[PDB]
């Protein structure tokens, strides 16, 4: 006979129900999570064996909304749910982003998380529910995972923070923020705001992190009851002798390579060093693992860059910790477009256009929580030539959908309403060059393109990405990070807004133990950065 | 930052602008080309090292039109540009076809060209602009490339040749021709004509080739100022000891194989020769490169066929240079179809149908230059069984769209206008057998299927493909070429039309230094060929 294991708990003004043990017993773990009539069925499958020559962690999160959850039959020609919509892709990223860094370094077994919305209360958003589901399922599975995580939406009504506000309550909110993290630290923040201050945005992150602790505690109590035994998994043992042989051939060369400021040169040299080092070690011993040599070489790169940041030495491009790269701002670059702009920050460049249209042109979104028409469209394209590569030119990638939405949230706060400006507006950002943050270059480029098109935005809007290097209690917050400083650093911390406030805040933290003080240094240092960018933008164009 | 390097020049009645150095600096080369407000941003990325075991040149051309170029928002449900339309696929082929033969023999590094239309004047076609852009970028890149090429559209108004006619001027034109080539020779021709003569069609090619020399001269000057250093690239050094070893095992057997006239039997034997030769050599010395052995074997194949053509010996199937293959013409082959035909020329066969419809059936084209309703539809299917193979049966591929349009241009000239025959007409060509030219068989099959359906076409229409083997000044023009004669020859030269003129002319030349004389001999010899086919077609059906 089937027996469900059920834990219920209060979370704000809602009841969260967690059920496991009777549905999908062949998955590594499966949980049915409900928050007042809104239910998501979440499963995890982790493969026991890693693939022969695997050197990257294959994690896939699939989020899918069934229309029977709302008592409706799909509006499409086939009357069936198909490829994930823009909304389903974004929520899949909301689940993926906080869980990814919690898998141990070296863990490369294939893991798949599938979340299916099976019931919906039109006042309760399934995204928070699905995130609690993924956390609970991963914690019960026994797969190496340093959770559990919680999830909380924070609003701001009457200058007071509100936990998981309903769809009706968000109409009065000056903020829509989602925060996920462990018992100890915040891992992911996604938000849009109506130009709130640095203190108001930080208080929301802290509030939501404190409120979601009841979710973490209840998953912990469910895990002690029904959790499967934790996998006997070990990282590959440290080979000190092989490290020394790689360091003897490469460290001194890689140290000089990471003082080359030009991106194209500096790789081209990094690749020569790695090729020559590996080919030399294989000439000595043909049985050596080529993947393992790449991981040791990458460990050297990381150590070279990180320790130079902590020592207070000049960064890869010669900059100091709080310097912004060179700026070039252009307006009216294309002759037949309604509004165009070319924004260049260092080796990152965005060709951004604005197009005015009519009702006809507004997007009809057949969403699960209720049909909605969209007047403001924001599309972000990242072609492979922006980083000097060749590749597919198919449909938009998940990263392109995510960054198009982030840049949209950075602009929405200053957009005129329908009474003031009764037109459909489409903004397209073409990333022509990339070396860090391209989505923040899209924010600046959009602001110039909208003004060029004569769109009466409240004020000019701009953004940057902040980085971090942290060992123990020691840390350095980096302004306007390069691609390398994002990949070898500890966070990507994006802030967008006008002169008077923050329109969007996004955090992607790759470590545990991020601190309130650190997030505040980042927010203050970010404010100075965007005021500098806005000043240059003002020189070019200051009004429609 | 440094300003871009800009070169302007008059091209007919337009001003062409070439900008490089400021946008997309991480691509191997990037050019913004403009012709009276019609602007295309073209990039090239060529990979530094070829994939370890590559034996074909991977060249990709991606042409894409952004709707913000015309000040419009996309009309699709997602309000975003998706998969390339037919029009975008055809223009990508217009760029690919002339540039492909200019990369050195043996060069197998991955090359990608991306052309994005960012601005459009509804009178100036972006296709020629994109071709000039691809030529400029490839020449600036430093990638081994024997250009630059020019590009010109030729019209025929009041019995005079007109350079790059506007969309309004084309309404008065009896011709729409596009020609591309180097300073020395023509490389690509794509055209539709209202039954013009051989001399009128040849004159259009020469005119367009002469007129585009100003484009070539200006790209050369821009390369002088802004061109990157030429890649240090060498072909594989010739191995005479290995050449003689392969020839000792294969040359005599391959000589007999290319006297087998049946296609299936010939290939079967060619494969047996290659398999046995490679296995014998890898048993003697297992460190031999299998790809190189395949390339030497292909070189022996090529020389055997080519030298036999030049010596004046009978062709692979026993034919003389100007002999057409056996014909079989059938009408009313399918019971429930409006009009059907089975056309067989040798081992090339096309099952062609015609279907009559209403205004509801007419295709609506959401084109960048203006929305447009198409009343004549031509679809071309090339299933893998046509060549005795297995493979995917998904959607149309780049060539199926290309040949479908070529066959459409071969029939367009004889179609009745909507004023006299107000119906939507769909023609479907099913290639059941293939060994040289299918798409000219589709032209013949369509003419018969349209008459069978009772469509009052002005005259019967037919076509053939012409070949060439050229060494120095010695050359031989081949009529109705085999697949082998196309692959081992120097050109595919297609001509379609009635008894009184040419409806379509297409050239795909694989060598430099093609001549006005050769093109003239090909056109005259092509005329006798279609008059022969039209004669046999008349014996079956001569009126709707």
């Amino acid at each position: 006979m089937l027996n469900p294991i059920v834990r219920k708990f209060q979370y704000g003004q809602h009841t969260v129900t967690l059920e496991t043990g009777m549905m999908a017993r062949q998955a590594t773990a499966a949980v049915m999570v409900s928050m007042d009539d809104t239910a998501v069925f979440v499963t995890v499958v982790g493969q026991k064996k890693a693939k022969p020559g695997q050197d990257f962690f294959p994690l896939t999160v699939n989020y899918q909304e069934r229309t029977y959850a709302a008592g409706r039959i799909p509006g499409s020609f086939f009357r069936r749910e198909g490829r994930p919509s823009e909304g389903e892709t974004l929520i899949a990223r909301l689940i993926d982003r906080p869980i990814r860094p919690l898998f141990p370094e070296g863990f490369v077994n294939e893991v798949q998380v599938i979340a299916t919305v099976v019931s919906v209360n039109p006042q309760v958003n399934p995204d928070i529910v699905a995130m609690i589901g993924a956390s609970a399922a991963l914690s019960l599975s026994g797969i190496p995972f340093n959770g559990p995580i919680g999830a909380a939406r924070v609003g701001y009504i009457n200058d007071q923070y509100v936990l998981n506000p309903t769809q009706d309550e968000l109409k009065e909110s000056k903020l829509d923020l989602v925060v996920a993290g462990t018992e100890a630290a915040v891992l992911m923040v996604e938000s849009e705001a109506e130009l709130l201050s640095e203190d108001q945005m930080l208080g929301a992150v802290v509030f939501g992190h404190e409120q979601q602790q009841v979710v973490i505690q209840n998953i912990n109590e469910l895990v002690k009851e029904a959790g499967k035994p934790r996998w006997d998994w070990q990282p590959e043992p440290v080979n000190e002798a092989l490290n020394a042989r790689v360091a003897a051939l490469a460290e001194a060369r890689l140290s000089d390579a990471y003082r080359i400021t030009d991106k194209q040169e500096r790789y081209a040299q990094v690749d020569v060093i790695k090729s020559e080092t590996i080919a030399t070690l294989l000439a000595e011993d043909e049985t050596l693992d080529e993947n393992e040599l790449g991981e040791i070489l990458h460990a050297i790169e990381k150590n070279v860059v990180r320790s130079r940041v902590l020592a207070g030495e000049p960064r890869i491009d010669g900059r100091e910790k709080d310097m912004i790269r060179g700026l070039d701002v252009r307006t009216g670059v294309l002759p037949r477009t309604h509004g165009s702009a070319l924004f260049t920050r260092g080796e990152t460049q965005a060709l951004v256009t604005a197009t005015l249209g009519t009702a006809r042109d507004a997007q009809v979104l057949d969403e699960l929580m209720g049909e909605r028409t969209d007047t403001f469209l924001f599309h972000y394209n990242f072609p492979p030539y922006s980083v000097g590569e060749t590749g597919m030119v198919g449909s938009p990638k998940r990263r392109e959908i995510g960054h198009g939405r982030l840049a949209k949230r950075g602009v929405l706060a200053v957009m005129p309403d329908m009474d003031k400006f009764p037109y459909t507006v489409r903004v397209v950002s073409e990333i022509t060059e990339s070396n860090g943050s391209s989505s923040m270059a899209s924010v600046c480029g959009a602001s110039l393109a909208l003004m060029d098109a004569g769109v009466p935005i409240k004020a000019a809007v701009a953004g940057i990405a902040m980085g971090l290097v942290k060992e123990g209690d020691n840390y350095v917050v980096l302004s306007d990070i390069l691609g390398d400083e994002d990949h070898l650093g500890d966070m990507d911390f994006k802030v967008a807004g006008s002169r008077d406030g923050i329109s969007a805040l996004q955090m992607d933290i790759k470590i545990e133990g991020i601190t309130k003080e650190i997030m505040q240094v980042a927010l203050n240092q970010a404010k100075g950065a965007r005021l500098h960018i806005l000043g240059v933008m003002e020189q070019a164009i200051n009004a429609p | 930052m440094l300003n871009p390097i800009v070169r302007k020049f008059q091209y007919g009645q337009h001003t062409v602008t070439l900008e490089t150095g400021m946008m997309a600096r991480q691509a191997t080369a990037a050019v913004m080309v403009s012709m009276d407000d019609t602007a295309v941003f073209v990039t090239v990325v060529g990979q530094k090292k070829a994939k370890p075991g590559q034996d074909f040149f991977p060249l990709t051309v991606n042409y894409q039109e952004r709707t913000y170029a015309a000040g419009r928002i996309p009309g699709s449900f997602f309000r975003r540009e998706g998969r390339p339309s037919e029009g975008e696929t055809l223009i990508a082929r217009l760029i690919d076809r002339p540039i492909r033969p200019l990369f050195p023999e043996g060069f197998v590094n991955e090359v990608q060209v991306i052309a994005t239309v960012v601005s459009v004047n509804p009178q100036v076609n972006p296709d020629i602009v994109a071709m000039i852009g691809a030529s400029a970028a490839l020449s600036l890149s430093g990638i081994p490339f024997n250009g630059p090429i020019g590009a010109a559209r030729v019209g025929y108004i009041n019995d005079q040749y007109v350079l790059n006619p506007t969309q309004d001027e084309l309404k008065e034109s009896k011709l729409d021709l596009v020609v591309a080539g180097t300073e020395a020779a023509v490389l690509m021709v794509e055209s539709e004509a209202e039954l013009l003569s051989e001399d009128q069609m040849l004159g259009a090619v020469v005119f367009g080739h002469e007129q585009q020399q100003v484009v070539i001269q200006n790209i050369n000057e821009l390369v002088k100022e802004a061109g990157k250093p030429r890649w240090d690239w060498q072909p594989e050094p010739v191995n005479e000891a290995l050449n003689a070893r392969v020839a000792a095992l294969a040359e005599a057997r391959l000589s007999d194989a290319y006297r087998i006239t049946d296609k299936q039997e010939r290939y079967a034997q060619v494969d047996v020769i290659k398999s046995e030769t490679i296995a014998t050599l890898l048993a003697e010395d297992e460190t031999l490169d299998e790809n190189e052995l395949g390339e030497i074997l292909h070189a022996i194949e090529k020389n055997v066929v080519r030298s036999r053509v030049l010596a004046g010996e009978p062709r692979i199937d026993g034919r003389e240079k100007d002999m057409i293959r056996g014909l079989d013409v059938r009408t009313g082959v399918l019971p429930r179809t409006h009009g059907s035909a089975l056309f067989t020329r040798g081992e090339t066969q096309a099952l062609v149908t015609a279907t009559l419809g209403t205004a509801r059936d007419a295709q609506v084209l959401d084109e960048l230059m203006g929305e447009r309703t198409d009343t004549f539809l031509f679809h071309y299917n090339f299933p893998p069984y046509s060549v005795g193979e297995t493979g995917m049966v998904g959607s149309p591929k780049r060539r199926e769209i290309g040949h479908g349009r070529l066959a459409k241009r071969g029939v367009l000239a004889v179609m009745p206008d909507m004023d006299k025959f107000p119906y939507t007409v769909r023609v479907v060509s099913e290639i059941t057998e293939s060994n040289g030219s299918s798409s000219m068989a589709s032209v013949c099959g369509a003419s018969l299927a349209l008459m069978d359906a009772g469509v009052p076409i002005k005259a019967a229409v037919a076509g053939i493909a012409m070949g060439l083997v050229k060494e120095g000044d010695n050359y031989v023009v081949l009529s109705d070429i085999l697949g082998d004669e196309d692959h081992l020859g120097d050109m595919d030269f297609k001509v379609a039309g009635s008894r009184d003129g040419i409806s379509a002319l297409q050239m795909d030349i694989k060598i430099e230094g093609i001549t006005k004389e050769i093109m003239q001999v090909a056109l005259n010899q092509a005329k006798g060929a279609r008059l022969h086919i039209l004669g046999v077609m008349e014996q079956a059906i001569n009126a709707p």
Partner: peptide, 20 residues
């Protein structure tokens, strides 16, 4: 004509530390 050379308005700044 298109490109950054045809800009209606333009401004630029060298790498800098912003005033706090």
């Amino acid at each position: 004509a298109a490109g950054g050379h045809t800009a209606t308005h333009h401004a630029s700044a060298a790498p800098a530390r912003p005033q706090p």
